[PDB]
Design a binder for this molecule. Structure first.
Ligand code: HEM
Length: 394
């Protein structure tokens, strides 16, 4: 006798388990056990992943319900699981989304300058360099302080909540609440700080005093700041880090992108497609009995949408494990999700990675791992897959 198949399969972000292709072929929706002991349906084909994400009866909001089967413990208050809905209900969605594009004057220049400064510091210090802690994550942090309009010097302390805030734990995490409450207090203070006039927090600070938002809560305004900083920094820093591994492990592609940087957007789209950054399937709770492939999912059951299941599905992306810069369907991957909860930061995330890679290839055309790939230490019980350090030479 064996136990019910457990998720997640592996914390390694440099290879897809061959179990994924076997599930997808044999049982593209199948029962699994999560770290909490709950049962869930793991969905691993492109067709069924899309079906689930495009049907809101598979609800994000309802995953926060008391007594539901859980992927992991909440690290935020339950109402905050519905953060985007709350933003939309407050009339703030258009303005929030506008503030977090890469489009503001000087933003791309700021990203390039920041990337180049970080790289110059690494070059001065000499190999080996840690491209996570000393490149990708500081670039993400700097970007999000700029996008939010908050002081650069405040970035590190906000950042240091993230190794706990984005845990994927069986149980509630006391430190997550300590840091959440502190970070909310910080953002509340930002909203009252007259120096903060630019970026997302500058905009929210004005809207907060406008009559059309007089009944929007102070708590929601502060929550937007904490949630968008955290989601954006963890997602961009982690994606860029693991994308850099994928790139470095493909010297021929590294060389091609170096030689023809106009190909970097197409390269980043493929790096998004093959990314293993999300450590768990995206969770949804069924609000009705719904047929998904061969399974009738019952009301109240948990469904996990495995992004690499979809993105490595050969029925949608032939030769799925290969980076091919001339695919006919390049942006149709699920790296940013799909449907109601599609990532509002997608354009910014693309730009962060494109500029980071452009800068790195120009400054370090010979970039290579400085340790055997198996020596990377993969963070466990976390909502992202990332190496603790990424040692490189050039
Ligand atoms: C390459 C970088 C990024 C990746 C791969 C990524 C991926 C995703 C995914 C897969 C989802 C959907 C989650 C779901 O449906 O359960 C999502 C949602 C979200 N992302 Fe991103 N993201 C990235 C960057 C960003 C940035 C830069 C921000 C903000 C500045 C951001 C903010 C959000 C927020 C707030 C949501 C929740 C939307 C909702 O609940 O409707 N993300 N992201």
């Amino acid at each position: 006798a064996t136990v019910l198949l457990e998720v997640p399969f592996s914390a390694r972000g440099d290879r897809i388990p061959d179990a994924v292709a076997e599930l997808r072929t044999r049982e593209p929706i199948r029962k699994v056990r999560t770290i909490t002991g709950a049962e869930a349906w793991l969905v691993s084909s492109y067709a069924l992943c899309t079906q689930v994400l495009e049907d809101r009866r598979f609800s994000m909001k309802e995953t926060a319900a008391a007594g539901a089967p859980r992927l992991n413990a909440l690290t935020v208050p339950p109402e905050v699981v519905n953060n985007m809905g709350n933003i939309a209900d407050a009339g703030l969605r258009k303005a929030v989304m506008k503030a977090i594009t890469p489009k503001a004057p000087g933003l791309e220049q700021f990203l390039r300058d920041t990337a180049n400064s970080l790289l110059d510091n690494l070059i001065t210090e000499g190999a080996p360099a840690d491209l996570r802690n000393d490149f990708a994550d500081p670039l993400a942090t700097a970007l999000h302080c700029k996008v939010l309009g908050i002081p650069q010097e405040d970035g590190p302390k906000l950042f240091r909540s993230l190794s706990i805030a984005f845990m994927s734990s069986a149980d509630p995490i006391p430190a997550a609440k300590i840091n959440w409450d502190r970070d909310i207090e910080y953002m509340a203070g930002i909203l009252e700080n007259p120096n903060i006039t630019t970026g997302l927090m500058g905009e929210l600070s004005r809207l907060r005093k406008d009559p059309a938002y007089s009944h929007v809560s102070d708590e929601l305004f502060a929550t937007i700041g904490v949630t968008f900083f955290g989601a954006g920094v963890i997602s961009t820093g982690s994606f860029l880090t693991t994308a850099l591994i994928s790139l470095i492990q493909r010297p021929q592609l590294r060389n091609l992108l170096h030689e023809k940087p106009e190909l970097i957007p197409a390269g980043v789209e493929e790096l998004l497609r093959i990314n293993l950054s999300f450590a768990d399937g995206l969770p949804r709770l069924a609000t009705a009995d719904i047929q998904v492939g061969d399974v009738l999912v019952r009301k109240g059951e948990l469904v996990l949408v495995l992004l690499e299941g979809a993105n490595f599905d050969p029925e949608h992306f032939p030769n799925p494990g290969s980076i091919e810069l001339d695919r006919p369907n390049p942006t149709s991957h699920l790296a940013f999700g799909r449907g109601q909860h599609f990532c509002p930061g997608s354009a910014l995330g693309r730009r962060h990675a494109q500029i980071g890679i452009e800068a790195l290839l120009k400054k370090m055309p010979g970039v290579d791992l400085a340790v055997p790939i198996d020596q990377l230490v993969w963070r466990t019980r976390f909502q992202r897959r990332i190496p603790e350090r990424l040692p490189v030479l050039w």
